[PDB]
């Protein structure tokens, strides 16, 4: 039989098959990485939303703060 033909054609197939699985498992890793980095970017935006929502409440209550302080200056005397 053509021994070298069989050994070579089989060696080329396992190299082709392992490389195909090599690239596939790398893509699946990047997909899970992109999944976490996206989920972290959304939790990070939800946190700044929670911050700006409180900072906006403080910015709106300033009018009442000034009036309440002005009133206590007239009473504590």
């Amino acid at each position: 039989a053509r021994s070298m033909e069989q050994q070579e054609d089989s060696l080329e197939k396992v190299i082709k098959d392992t490389e195909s699985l090599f690239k596939t498992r790398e893509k699946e890793y990047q997909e899970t990485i992109d999944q976490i980095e996206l989920e972290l970017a959304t939790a990070k935006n939800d946190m700044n939303r929670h911050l700006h929502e409180y900072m906006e409440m403080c910015s709106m209550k300033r009018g009442l703060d000034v009036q309440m302080e002005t009133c206590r200056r007239l009473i504590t005397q």
Partner: protein, 213 residues
Amino acid sequence: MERKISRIHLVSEPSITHFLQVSWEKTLESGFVITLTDGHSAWTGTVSESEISQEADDMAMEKGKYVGELRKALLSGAGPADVYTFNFSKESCYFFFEKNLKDVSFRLGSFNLEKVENPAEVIRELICYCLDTIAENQAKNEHLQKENERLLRDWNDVQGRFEKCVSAKEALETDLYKRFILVLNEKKTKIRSLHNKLLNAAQEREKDIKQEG
């Protein structure tokens, strides 16, 4: 030194009105000066501390209770229905007064008020005291009236300023509900868009089935 000027009606002279000017320091118990006058003559007597004790003892009345009856009778601070009768004899210059009840009369005092030589000097000093008192009283009126005009303007300032706190608070709670609705409507608009997205997906699926077979 204090004093009190009071109007009395003698039963000896019931037609007119007399005046009693009692002066003491610092309490009526330690002795006092008492003067009767009709706007013409004046009789003055000094009742010492010992005479007040003697007057109470001769009627077996406790001193404190008796001194309390002098204030009620001589300082015009009693009744109704505390009835008192006042007598004066211009001959003996004795001043009598008694507390009259329906069944008993308590002879409270008998003071000798010798006639003064210059009653006009006493009447003038009495009127000078009343005029000075009226001037003092109207000054306390103007000073107390001024404190209310200030106390009521302090109240009117707080009233107008606190109603600004209420209006600011209401304008805040309104802006909080406006901000809440504006965001709530965006989230409802997004859910409505996802519903149509789900609806569109199912519709574009039926087209892909009817055409592919």
